[PDB]
């Protein structure tokens, strides 16, 4: 668990995708909660933070270089047996309660030129998102506005300084993809994120109200199928559950059909469900005991 330098090691979060070795059944990501419910559900479930522990004969190398795109060489390395817990366990579009970037807003991808790969954004200034039982999440418009301005600025830096950066709503065949879908404990929020992703930046005139209110549907997990990976839901007729997180980053995919050579279009969400996991796993690499 200790850390020392003077030994360089090569990393590549792409070739060594380590969520690719975290494929255990859904019924083991949840344990039955014994929380004295003393209105109540018969059985309740709690999520266990997502993490990876190195099996015997193997160790996990952790790159401690703060600003690190995930690939290339790494000087400051350390040895651990487990990666750091990821919470929340699902998060489709926004990334909450993650680690903030040092001084700079950082974006990364396995291949920026390949629109198939997810773009993972890491902010340096957290944006609060307060959600309630009444079925809505709130985000300060001024703070989100500045966030997009900083993100669009980095995206330009990656795709060319004279590119107009356009944010559009998700496109997909399920609410888990289309909405910002995340869990705060055993309560799952499906939030309409159209309002967060409906702007264009730096076209010809770019150099609403007080708060952005996202409508959200809330479901409570009450069971699941183990060999199928299917969750089972019920309305939270339990009452009003509150949840406040920090937006610390986000997932984007870039459009491949865009006929405008002067713009790039980005939509919220990744190309894979476990992309939220990947946003937190770029500094690790599994190796054999030396």
């Amino acid at each position, epitope marked *: 668990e200790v850390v020392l330098v003077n030994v360089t090691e090569n990393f590549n979060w792409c070739k060594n995708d380590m969520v690719e070795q975290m494929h255990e059944d859904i019924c083991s990501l949840w344990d039955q909660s014994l929380k004295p419910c003393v209105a109540c559900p018969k059985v309740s479930f709690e999520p266990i933070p997502i993490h990876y522990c190195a099996p015997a004969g193997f160790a996990i190398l952790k790159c401690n270089n703060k600003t690190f795109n995930g690939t290339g060489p790494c000087t400051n390395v350390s040895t651990v047996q487990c990666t750091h817990g990821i919470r929340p366990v699902v998060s489709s579009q926004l990334l909450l309660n993650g680690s903030l970037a040092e001084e700079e807003v950082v974006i990364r991808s396995c291949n920026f030129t390949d629109n198939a790969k997810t773009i993972i954004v890491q902010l340096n200034t957290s944006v609060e998102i307060n959600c309630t039982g009444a079925g809505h999440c709130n985000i300060a418009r001024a703070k989100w506005n500045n966030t997009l301005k900083q993100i669009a600025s980095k995206l330009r830096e990656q795709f060319g300084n004279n590119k107009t950066i356009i944010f559009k709503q998700s496109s997909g065949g399920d609410p888990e*993809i*289309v909405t910002h879908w995340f869990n705060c404990g055993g309560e799952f929020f499906y939030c309409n994120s*159209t309002q967060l992703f409906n702007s264009t930046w730096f076209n010809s005139t770019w150099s609403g109200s007080d708060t952005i209110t996202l409508p959200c549907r809330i479901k409570q997990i009450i069971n699941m199928w183990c060999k199928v990976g299917k969750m089972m839901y019920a309305p939270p007729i339990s009452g009003q559950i509150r949840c406040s997180s920090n937006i610390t980053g986000l997932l984007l995919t870039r459009d491949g059909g865009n006929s405008n050579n002067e713009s790039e279009i980005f939509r919220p969400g990744g190309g894979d469900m476990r992309d939220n996991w990947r946003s937190e796993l770029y500094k690790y690499k599994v190796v054999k005991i030396e």
Partner: antibody
Framework: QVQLVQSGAEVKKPGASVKVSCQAS????????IHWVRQAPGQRFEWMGW????????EFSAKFQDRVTFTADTSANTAYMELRSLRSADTAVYYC????????????????????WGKGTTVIVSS | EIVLTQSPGTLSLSPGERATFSCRSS???????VAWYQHKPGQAPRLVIH???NRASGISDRFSGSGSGTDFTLTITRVEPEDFALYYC?????????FGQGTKLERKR
């Protein structure tokens, strides 16, 4: 334009297996469920199952669950259907089809109709 | 399990005439998840109607779907030569996927 391109016609012996591919273009492949449906000579269309490229989740028709495997390669924008223990009655045109777009106002699976179809691939099972 | 039965088996009409396709379900379709497909020989089937009454993209406004519960209808105000084809109804979603046996829209002479 949204398009599904399927692999060429196939001739198989009974007891063998066949793998049919379905390649997408014009949209984000991983973001839409894909259905597999067949129609044998003189028969109705039969739904075999679906796969979700985004999470690997699948669903099977009880008629085919034991003999069929759905798979996806997002890096290749391709979904695959493999049917094993083939029999002469499995002789059919096999179609992939994408679900329609989901919207906030929909209930889950309101969009699970067959929005865009491939042209199909003929599978012949015969000795 | 849900059985869909279409009528008539064959619809013989001239261009300009109204067409009415019937789909009858053994089960009341509360979800309103009924679709209609057009299929021409050697061509990919095409979505015409979804959600009982929603015209699919690119579909002529001569097409419309209606009905409820057990009885569903596809109608074409005035048939055009390109409408000649097979038409299938189907139920979809919630593990219930099933198709009618089809109705042939052929040209009268």
């Amino acid at each position: 334009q949204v398009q599904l391109v399927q692999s060429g016609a196939e001739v198989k012996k009974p007891g063998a297996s066949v793998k049919v591919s379905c390649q997408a273009s014009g949209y984000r492949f991983s973001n839409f469920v894909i259905h597999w449906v067949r129609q044998a000579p003189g028969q109705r269309f039969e739904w075999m199952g679906w796969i979700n490229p985004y999470n690997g989740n699948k669903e099977f028709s009880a008629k085919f669950q034991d003999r069929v495997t759905f798979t996806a390669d997002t890096s290749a924008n391709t979904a695959y259907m493999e049917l094993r223990s083939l029999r002469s009655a499995d002789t059919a045109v096999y179609y992939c089809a994408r679900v329609g777009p989901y919207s906030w106002d929909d209930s889950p699976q309101d969009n699970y109709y067959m929005d865009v179809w491939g042209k199909g691939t003929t599978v012949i099972v015969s000795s | 399990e849900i059985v869909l039965t279409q009528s008539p088996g064959t619809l013989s009409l001239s261009p300009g005439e109204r067409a009415t396709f019937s789909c009858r379900s053994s089960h009341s379709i509360r979800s309103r998840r009924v679709a209609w497909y057009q299929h021409k020989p050697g061509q990919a089937p095409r979505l015409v109607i979804h959600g009982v009454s929603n015209r699919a993209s690119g579909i002529s406004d001569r097409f419309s779907g209606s009905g409820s519960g057990t009885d569903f209808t596809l109608t074409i105000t005035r048939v055009e030569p390109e409408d000649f084809a097979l038409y299938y109804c189907q139920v979809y979603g919630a593990s219930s996927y099933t198709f009618g046996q089809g109705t042939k829209l052929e040209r009268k002479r």
